[PDB]
Amino acid sequence: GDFLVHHAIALGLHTTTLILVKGALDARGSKLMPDKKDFGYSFPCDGPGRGGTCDISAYDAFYLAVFWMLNTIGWVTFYWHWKHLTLWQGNVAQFDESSTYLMGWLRDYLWLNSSQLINGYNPFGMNSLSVWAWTFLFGHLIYATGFMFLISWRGYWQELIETLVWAHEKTPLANLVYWKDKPVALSIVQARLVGLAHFSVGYIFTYAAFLIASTSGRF
């Protein structure tokens, strides 16, 4: 099980290095964009021409690499937490026998250690572990919110904002209060950053809450 998870760790490290190294070497230009060095480090794209140039800047390579970094650290922290949990519980054979198949990781580690966490508050009352349950759901909500900025893109939002602008401008008792800044949709780069920030915050808070709650309740 340790051998297999170490190979998974090596996979995560090599893929993250691949994305980062490729983005750093292709930052000055490639065959698709021979003049990428003249556009700066961060820019939206080169337009829909030449088949499409979405996520062509080096900033976008870093952006895609953050997900792989979070996934790699997630694997290493999952391995550390499970091995030490089985060691502290006095049964290392459980980890040695269930760390070779993913069902063991999903049931014996993620499902078995979250029983006390999600029981922090229920209709029968609550205990000191309710804050970690709230943090768990908080991180899940932030992660899912990041998925919105990650999947849905600018155009739809800008058109919706234009409709809202018309609605506010044609509403009595409310058009007297006008904005000082014209409301516009978030930019592509800003959208990627916002989605990445929500993804990372939800990821970190969810794992920290689960880790502390499971380790504190078990011991």
């Binding site: 000191s128 014209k182 978030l186 930019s187 950053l193």
Partner: protein, 147 residues
């Protein structure tokens, strides 16, 4: 018209949309991209930023020391570091009802407190801290160093 914010980018200041605020907030530390930036001024701005970051780090450390000396149980944790849980700081939340108050009241405290997981208790106990007076003196010294 042109707004005062941001002061480091006249192009962003002339932006009449909400993009101006977001971009001004996200490009404040990009010293090389400001208006009228030279090499000497760039290095000086980074020097000041380094000092400000050091002050923030030291003030945060002093805050941790102060809260452990005030609401923590370091004087009692050192006598029994196996069966006593460390206390981070107290909790003052008006939203808590009666069950939350008695649920968070643990670790030998008199009110709702947070049990620390940072491990500063073991580190401070190992380096020599024994009484809360030591933590208070360390917090005052680190706050003055940050200033």
């Amino acid at each position: 018209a042109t707004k005062l914010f941001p002061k480091f980018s006249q192009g962003l200041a002339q932006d009449p949309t909400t993009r101006r605020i977001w971009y001004g907030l996200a490009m404040a530390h990009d010293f090389e991209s400001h208006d009228g930036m030279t090499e000497e001024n760039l290095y000086q701005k980074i020097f000041a930023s380094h000092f400000g970051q050091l002050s923030i780090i030291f003030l945060w450390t002093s805050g941790n020391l102060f809260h452990v000396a005030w609401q923590g149980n370091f004087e009692q944790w050192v006598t029994d570091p196996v069966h006593i849980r460390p206390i981070a700081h107290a909790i003052w939340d008006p939203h808590f009802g009666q069950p939350a108050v008695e649920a968070f009241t643990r670790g030998g405290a008199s009110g709702p407190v947070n049990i620390s997981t940072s491990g500063v208790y073991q580190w401070w106990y190992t380096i020599g801290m024994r009484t809360n007076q030591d933590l208070y003196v360390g917090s005052v010294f680190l706050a003055l160093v940050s200033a």
